[PDB]
Amino acid sequence: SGKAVDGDTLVLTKEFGLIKIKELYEKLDGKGRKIVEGNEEWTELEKPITVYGYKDGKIVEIKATHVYKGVSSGMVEIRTRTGRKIKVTPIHRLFTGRVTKDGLILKEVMAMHVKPGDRIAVVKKIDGGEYIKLDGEIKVPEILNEELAEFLGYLMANGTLKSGIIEIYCDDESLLERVNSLSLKLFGVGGRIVQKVDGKALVIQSKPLVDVLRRLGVPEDKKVENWKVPRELLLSPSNVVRAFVNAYIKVEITLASEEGAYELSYLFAKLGIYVTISKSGEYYKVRVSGNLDTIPVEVNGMPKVLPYEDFRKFAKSIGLQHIIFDEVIDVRYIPEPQEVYDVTTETHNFVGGNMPTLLHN
Ligand code: NI
Ligand code: NI
Ligand code: NI
């Protein structure tokens, strides 16, 4: 086998958003020049796609030129403290590393040899994105600007899409006037703040508004099985995502959708926001804290581990990041054959996993 990952491993791409690598492979398969050797297959893509990777000290957009599928006789599963869970072939590479006076020093380690306590590299800040254009009756904003994203923030944070009706509950009357004002501004349709008998609420009665908001990917409400972040938000610029997130939080988020929680970790990473995920019973809890409680550094040119409050003093001393170092809590070998997948990029690394992780093929 080569250096490869489980088919459910999420990958952030420009062309398809956040997608499991087996589903990306099915879309790029054979679209180019193909080489088959037994159970392994390589395609040199006729049209390279765009993914994200570590390059010149930043997490940025990069080209991906080749795809791979084969079989591995077993896998390694690595669980870290922030909640990353990555399933990879034993020779797949990850990065350990340290913070020094002149930036990060990294070191490749095969997944088979990662042990608990290792500080592996994960992605805290994603640079990238561009304004997305969207698809008469209710007027619709033609690009996904900051105002539309702010509206969608409030909506998905505490709004439902009953009937052909939109309802948004809260206190803080200024938030609710803001939502109605933005609704009139963007869509030309307003609502009245019906002081409901539980608390205050805004309600907009427009059958075609809930419909285009559904087409945008807005969930009918929270507490739904397939709750997901609208695709276009992951692909948007940083200021748009900030307009969304500042509205979505008025700090923890409980969901029943594994996928939606993972997508949220990517959305927050696009703002450099440190995020953890935990699973209580069947529910997922996305917690929004800027780094771990201990940080691996180089002092005296020698390795050391510093608590957070000594690390911050040392870091302010030297001028301080897109990458941080998560702590492994569990390494497991799974002796089970499965299909594995890979994507070749110019940097020989890419950003994937249930939470943004720097993977090295
Ligand atoms: Ni290498
Ligand atoms: Ni940056
Ligand atoms: Ni509220």
Q: Mapping DSSP to helix (H, G, I), strand (E, B) and coil, where does residue 350 land?
A: strand
The residues whose Cβ lies within 5 A of ligand 3, an ion, are 170
Q: Among all chains, which residue has been given the structure tokens 């997490």?
A: 59
Which residues are CB-neighbours of 30 under 8 A, at least 6 positions away?
43
Beta-carbon neighbour count of residue 239 at 10 Å? 13
Interior angle at CA 51, CA 331 and CA 101, nearest 5:
65
Distance 224 CA to ligand 3 centre (A): 20
What is the dihedral sign for C-alpha 81, 83, 84, 89? positive
* Cα separation, 11 vs 161, whole angstroms: 30
* Cα separation, 82 vs 79, whole angstroms: 9
DSSP tag of 133? B
What is the dihedral sign for C-alpha 256, 259, 260, 261? positive
Q: Among all chains, which residue has been given the structure tokens 């009706």?
A: 165
Distance 251 CA to ligand 3 centre (A): 13
Residue 99: name the closest of 294, 257, 348 by CA.
294
Q: How was this structure determined?
A: X-ray
Interior angle at CA 317, CA 312 and CA 319, nearest 5:
90
DSSP tag of 195? B
Which two tokens mark 255?
A: 């969901």
DSSP assignment of 25-63:
HHHHTTSEEEEEETTEEEEEEEEEEEEEEEETTEEEEEE
Distance 169 CA to ligand 3 centre (A): 7
The residues whose Cβ lies within 5 A of ligand 1, an ion, are 108
Among all ligands shown, which has an atom nearest to the Cα of 57? 2
Beta bridge partners of 67: 43, 343
Q: Among all chains, which residue has been given the structure tokens 């911050």?
A: 312
Distance of CA 330 to the CA centre of its chain: 22
Residue 217: name the closest of 126, 144, 136, 283 by CA.
144
Distance 327 CA to ligand 2 centre (A): 23
Q: Among all chains, which residue has been given the structure tokens 């996904």?
A: 144
Of the chain, the end-to-end C-alpha distance in Å amounts to 12
Which residues are CB-neighbours of 357 under 8 A, at least 6 positions away?
84, 86, 94, 120, 121, 122, 123, 351
Fold of domain 146-288: Endonuclease I-creI (3.10.28)
DSSP tag of 198? S
Q: Mapping DSSP to helix (H, G, I), strand (E, B) and coil, where does residue 264 land?
A: helix
Distance of CA 3 to the CA centre of its chain: 23
Distance 84 CA to ligand 2 centre (A): 22
| Half-sphere CA count of 195, side-chain side, radius 13 A | 2
Residue 240: name the closest of 133, 131, 313, 315 by CA.
131
Contact yes or no for 274/124 (Cβ under 8 A) = yes
* Cα separation, 60 vs 54, whole angstroms: 7
